[PDB]
Amino acid sequence: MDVVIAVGAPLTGPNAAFGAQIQKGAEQAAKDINAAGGINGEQIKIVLGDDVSDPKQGISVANKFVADGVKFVVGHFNSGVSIPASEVYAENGILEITPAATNPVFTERGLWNTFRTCGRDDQQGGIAGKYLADHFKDAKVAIIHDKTPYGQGLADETKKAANAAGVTEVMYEGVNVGDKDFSALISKMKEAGVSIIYWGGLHTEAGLIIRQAADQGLKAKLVSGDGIVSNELASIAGDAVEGTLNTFGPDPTLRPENKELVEKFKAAGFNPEAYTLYSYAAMQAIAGAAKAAGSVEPEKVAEALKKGSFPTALGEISFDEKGDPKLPGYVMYEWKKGPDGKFTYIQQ
Numbered sequence: 001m002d003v004v005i006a007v008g009a010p011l012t013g014p015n016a017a018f019g020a021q022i023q024k025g026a027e028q029a030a031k032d033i034n035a036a037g038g039i040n041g042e043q044i045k046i047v048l049g050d051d052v053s054d055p056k057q058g059i060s061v062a063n064k065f066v067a068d069g070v071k072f073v074v075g076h077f078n079s080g081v082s083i084p085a086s087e088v089y090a091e092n093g094i095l096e097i098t099p100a101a102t103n104p105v106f107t108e109r110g111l112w113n114t115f116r117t118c119g120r121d122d123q124q125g126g127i128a129g130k131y132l133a134d135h136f137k138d139a140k141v142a143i144i145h146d147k148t149p150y151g152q153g154l155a156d157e158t159k160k161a162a163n164a165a166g167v168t169e170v171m172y173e174g175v176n177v178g179d180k181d182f183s184a185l186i187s188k189m190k191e192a193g194v195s196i197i198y199w200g201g202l203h204t205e206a207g208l209i210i211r212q213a214a215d216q217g218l219k220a221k222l223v224s225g226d227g228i229v230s231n232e233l234a235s236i237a238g239d240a241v242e243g244t245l246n247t248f249g250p251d252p253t254l255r256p257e258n259k260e261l262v263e264k265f266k267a268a269g270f271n272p273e274a275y276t277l278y279s280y281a282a283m284q285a286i287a288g289a290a291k292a293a294g295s296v297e298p299e300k301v302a303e304a305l306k307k308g309s310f311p312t313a314l315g316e317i318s319f320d321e322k323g324d325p326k327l328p329g330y331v332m333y334e335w336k337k338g339p340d341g342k343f344t345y346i347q348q
């Protein structure tokens with residue numbers, strides 16, 4: 001029959017825009033592959049499952065996929081959703097390739113079925129920790145995190161790397177996802193002389209910290225990672241977003257080879273920023289591996305991914321024995337005004 005492929009993502013909630021990056025990128029790839037003859041002569045059927053960035057909801061989504069005969073899942077977005085959902089998939093013969101979950105644990109559990117098109121946070125924290133050392137040598141650094149597996153994980157990888165290169169944070173604090181008032185923490189950071197705020201977490205909380213920090217007169221730069229790369233940050237944060245820093249892969253939309261693809265998304269009215277092409281590529285990889293493997297059986301395609309190499313919107317993609325991709329590493333971005341005059345992220 002058709003090859004049933006699920007999108008497991010935050011289609012609603014604070015991270016809906018990310019959920020839409022993943023959905024649109026996955027739907028466009030299925031559309032393109034199908035018009036090309038599908039996977040090994042078979043058409044791809046997309047199903048959608050909304051995890052609302054909640055682990056328990058993600059587990060329910062995963063069990064549903066299992067039931068609907070899903071064979072491949074592109075997703076999820078959050079590490080804390082992906083890690084538990086992957087067990088459910090591992091047990092019920094379903095290959096999961098995440099375009100966005102970066103926590104090392106995802107691929108460090110020996111599971112047959114876990115792959116990514118994105119990097120991992122030992123890599124990302126490496127880069128950031130070093131950068132803090134290469135540019136804020138004597139700054140009073142606060143490390144703040146959202147108490148999630150992703151957010152605390154990245155903040156810990158960043159702290160580890162920084163601590164090691166010589167930089168010793170003056171504060172290390174967790175906040176709760178959904179919290180809206182950071183005055184106390186901000187008042188704490190001001191007493192501490194904080195001039196750099198390193199945030200392991202997502203854009204919602206990040207934008208509020210930026211906004212309120214400026215309003216309380218804390219002159220500190222926020223440095224974060226992949227979780228803040230959505231154009232909503234500028235709205236949440238306001239003009240205070242200027243000068244914010246964050247790590248992320250090289251922007252795939254800037255790849256000359258993607259020019260026509262990017263233009264197609266844009267003609268459809270969607271700006272395929274950030275994780276959109278990472279998701280497109282997840283789909284490319286499944287198709288490329290299945291062809292190399294002469295099979296659409298998930299266990300076999302998984303073996304194919306680990307062995308083969310495949311053309312994608314992200315470049316030539318290969319995978320190591322754990323399912324991690326071999327691709328260009330994390331680079332630093334700064335938030336500045338674009339041509340249109342609004343703040344966005346540009347590689348330094």
Ligand SMILES: CC(C)[C@H](N)C(=O)O
Nearest residue numbers: 078079101102150227
């Ligand atoms: C959600 C995403 C931005 C993050 N990399 C995570 O693993 O949760």
Ligand SMILES: [Ca+2]
Nearest residue numbers: 079080148150
């Ligand atoms: Ca998480």
Ligand SMILES: [Ca+2]
Nearest residue numbers: 306307319320
């Ligand atoms: Ca390999």
